[model samples]
Target chain A: DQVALQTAMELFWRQGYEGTSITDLTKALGINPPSLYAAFGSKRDLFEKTLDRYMCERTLQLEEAMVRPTAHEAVLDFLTGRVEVFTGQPFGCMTVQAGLASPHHEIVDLLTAAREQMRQTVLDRFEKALADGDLPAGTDCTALARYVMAAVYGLSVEAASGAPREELTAAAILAAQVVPRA
Target chain B: DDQVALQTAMELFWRQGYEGTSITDLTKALGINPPSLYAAFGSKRDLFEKTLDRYMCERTLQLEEAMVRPTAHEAVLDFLTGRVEVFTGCMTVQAGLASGEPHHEIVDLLTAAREQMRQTVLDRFEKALADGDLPAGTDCTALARYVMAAVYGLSVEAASGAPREELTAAAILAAQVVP
Candidate 1:
């Protein structure tokens, strides 16, 4: 069905990176081993595809939210937007779930880059707000943006640990509250 | 030899997780075959269980001590800071693998670890109230949830490539909120 990509995404997203082996993937994708090798190359390669898709979907909202009416609202919108997607969609995060299996003290490269991009986006919004006299003249926007992203990062683990959506939303607000107000 | 086995097993489990690390992986890492491994540890599950013990003892000894500091804030500062040092970010971040359900044992391990962490904060918050460090009216349990949840979040953040120092600083912000 050439649905191999979507099918593997669902399986890997649900079962997790370390948990989903080639056997698991093969049966789920409705393809034999050779076809899988020919189509996707390797387990790691397929994983990257799914991971890239998930993050690309996430960054779509991130890019849109970064251009909100105000810096403070932009960051809040982004964080709350994340919780909204996190709770309802796919039931968990691969970045937090699958990416943890990496033996090194690192995560998926695209996910890392995207987070940095989001932080820079947040910083740009703050700088804009400052220029427009929304925040103070000498505000330390960089630290505030970093703190904002840090809190978002923490929210993912709580979600994975089965923290309820309602509570997670509230926790998101808690982290959002700490974002330096304009 | 036993300690070496446990440490080796801990490394594999921590790095690759439970579902990821097969019995053969363990045997290869520990320098034993399936027969010896089973004879010594009963089951792969049992080996992981014991490895959890070793990780807590040999690795997280400082966390165990820091959880019971005289003040709640100090308890968490010690914990959140110690995690950056020992866990290289946070405990559950790299410790638990990528999936949730169908691996009930792993889920249970992570849940128990987080709860134990909450209790660590809760115990001292109770102490804080008793010692008048916190007001008697302080919502101790909710406060515990606030800090513990953020710490949990920080681990997730750490997993996302946030450095330890940055993670620690964000954690301090939540720790202050418990006040």
Candidate 2:
């Protein structure tokens, strides 16, 4: 069941929610629609579970990256780390790439929340950096966070669009340069 | 009639993406039949190519007009300001988010357009350097890419249900980016 669910997650990441009809799933999984329905509940239910599993790994990776020794390292870890994840996979950031064309409210709401969650996490890190003197005092953390998030989002879009890995990495590197409070 | 059909197709494509919008949707929106849409525009991919070009022409015109805005700063603002409208209003400009074969042509379109944008910014920056409009010896290539990434980044935010005021506020931060 776990293996099947994992493979389904990869499919969702590759094909997107709207594009991945149940017929695609059956062929990919070598199961009939009835069996899939019986095993996973509904198509959306299975997708939800797959999304859940996907986020679990993603969140852990992010948590590890966000806790780097310094705020700058932390930012690099988050942004460059994200590029790695996007290119390492067959497609890219499933949430951003797949969620774009999805008219479904569930996916839309989730992606929006996830973006905010990341921005806020990065924001909190910057605020703490200010207190610690890792960054200059009076840093505009909100604006700074937005800058980082934009680059990160931009990289995801690029990766999803099949940008050369170097392009994605260069964007990540340049983005991290703009993070310093000075 | 062809011009009218093209404009209608333009808006429908703007609202949805290439893959998301169907032939049925285009016909219904244009108030034409499937055969007429096929005959007038050719196959779906061919029409996609046409509609995308129409969208690109408007973008090129907008970018070119911004070049003559009197100063590098004003020109950058003009481009960014127009983009907040165009990027949100047109799907073709923000073509990256759409999923993967229709992808190859769309990717080529975006890449070529970006190169053009890069050149336009580089030209503006070069002119600015000669006129002392920009700080000396700035890396023009990098800044152009930054502007491109920044605008599209905001487009993503806007498409994800963010408000205009929020984007407007972010734009102020973006202004700090140019100089």
Candidate 3:
């Protein structure tokens, strides 16, 4: 069951949610329709599970980075970690790049929720830094977080299209630098 | 028959998608039977490749002269302005921007063609820099690539009903990097 679910997750990530058919899922999972239905309940249910799995993996990665020794290190880790993800093999953010490909309302809703969660996470981290005096007071951490998010999205799109790692890294560093000192 | 069929296929693929377009749509557009359509174009994918080739050829010819002119900087400006004028309700970019499904062959071809055009601008910029027409240490290659991506983004934004004047303003701002 875990293997089948993982297979479906990869298929949906590679081909996008709208493009993947139930047959494709079953075939890729090496499972019959009845078996898949029995295990995952329904096609939508399986997709929802895939999304949850992806989100959980992301949350774990963020927690690992955000728990760094210093606020500056945490912020750098967050931005640079995104660079690594965007430029790595099997490039592009499933949430941002492949998400936009989905036209389904429910799928779009899921993606939007994921994006907002990411933004809020960044905002919360920045807020903590501000409160700790690591970042200057009266700084618009929320706006800065949003800008970083956009830059990260742009970097992912560019990287997916085969933009060089150095160039993408430069852009990520530029995004990280946008936060003014307190 | 070939011309008519190709035109029909282009329109369908442009408006819908490679996957969304069906044999019925092609047959109806071409006013022909499936046998005839197959006999003429071999396959749907084959026909799409041909359409993409023709579109790229036409696009290159339209901008080639302006892009390769002696005044390389001005050529870049002319190339961009010309793109702004011609991109209205266009089919080529619409197909390029369409997502969903593994349109790998289609996406690969489109992206390669786009990168080719970007390289053309970059080559022209390199020539200017070599001839002492532009400043030293100018990352013309990166700049050219950036301009192409920006243009593509602007085109998608325009197709989504962005104001024409706003698109023009953005294009002009992008061209300011040339000098």
Candidate 4:
């Protein structure tokens, strides 16, 4: 079941929610549709499970990255680390790639909430950095968070579009420069 | 008929994406039969290519006009400002970004168009570096990439239904990175 879920994540990450059909999932998972449904309940359920699993790994990685001693290191590591993730496997952030233009609200809404949550997690990190004097006074953490999120989202788009890893790393390096060192 | 057909096709692909919009959707949107759409546009992918070309022409014009501004700062500010004024979600990002195997070609074309645009911007920035509009030691390639990143970021925000005020502010914030 875990292996099937991982395979489904790859399919959904590459093809997107609207683009991947149940038949595709069944074939990819090497299981019958009835059994797939029996295990996951519905296509949505399966996708949500994939998202859950995907975020689990992402959250841990992010949590680890966000803890770098200096806020600048934290931001740079977060951005550059994402470049590695974007290039390593399926070539896009699953949260951003999963349902950008799907007709189904369920998928779009779920992805949107995930994005917002991702943004907030970064925002809180910045907020704490500001409190700790890692970021300068008068730093607009909201705009700063949005700026970082944009880089992450933009990097995913670039990777999906076949940007080589080096180019993305360069971009990540430049974007992280937006954060000032204390 | 061809002009109208291409424009309509661009709009559909812009809104619904390559996989999201089907041949039937294009036919119905254009009020043409399948045979006519095929005869005129070749295939769904070909029609999308045409729409992309049309979209690219407009973008090229916008970037060229912005590049003509006296200062690189003014040029970039104008580029970002012009984008926010029109502020419909980006066609490149909407039409591609993600796709299935059957339409991976669509994503390829869209990515090529974006990279082409970014290359143009990079050329302009290099020119600015030579002309002293940008700092002597500036990394123009990295600078161009940074600007491109911000533009796509704005596109995502627009697609997410961000308000115009927010987009305008975001664009301003992005251009402030020019130094």
DockQ each candidate and list the results.
0.20, 0.20, 0.08, 0.27
What residue runs in model 2 are displaced by over 4 Å at the alpha carbon? Answer: A1-26, A29-57, A88-92, A98-106, A135-138, A161-164, B1-58, B69-74, B85-100, B103-111, B125-139, B175-179
Q: How does each model score on lDDT?
A: 0.63, 0.65, 0.59, 0.70
What's the TM-score of chain B for every model shown?
Answer: 0.62, 0.66, 0.65, 0.68
Query: How well is each residue in A14-36 modelled by candidate 4, as lDDT tens digits?
Result: 56688899999989988898998
Fnat scores for every prediction: 0.24, 0.13, 0.00, 0.22
What DockQ does predicted model 4 obtain?
0.27
Tens-place lDDT digits, model 4, residues B4-58: 7887786576557687888889999999999999899888989887777655423
Which runs in model 4 stand beyond 4 Å of their true positions? A1-7, A10-26, A31-57, A88-91, A98-105, B1-58, B91-112
Worst 10 residues of 1 chain B by lDDT: B93-102
Error (Å) of candidate 1 at residue A171 is 1.3
Candidates in order, TM-scores: namely 0.64, 0.64, 0.50, 0.71
* lDDT per residue (tens digit) for residues A91-135 in model 3: 244443332211344444665666667767777778888877877
Q: After TM-score superposition, what is the CA distance of residue B58 in candidate 1 from its true location, in Å?
A: 14
Model 2 residue A162 lDDT score: 58
- Among incorrect, acceptable, medium and high, the docking class of model 1 is incorrect
**Cα lDDT over the full model 4:** 0.70
User: For residues B56-125, could you state the per-residue lDDT of candidate 3 as single tens digits?
Assistant: 4226665678876776667866776676676552222312212334345555655667667767777888
List runs of model 3 lying over 4 Å from the truth: A1-85, A88-102, A105-157, A168-182, B1-31, B34-50, B53-58, B69-72, B89-108
Clashing pairs in 2: none
Candidate 1 lDDT, B38-156, residue by residue in tens: 89887988998887764441233566688667776777777766665544523344223233323444545655777666666677788789988787787776566556556555565
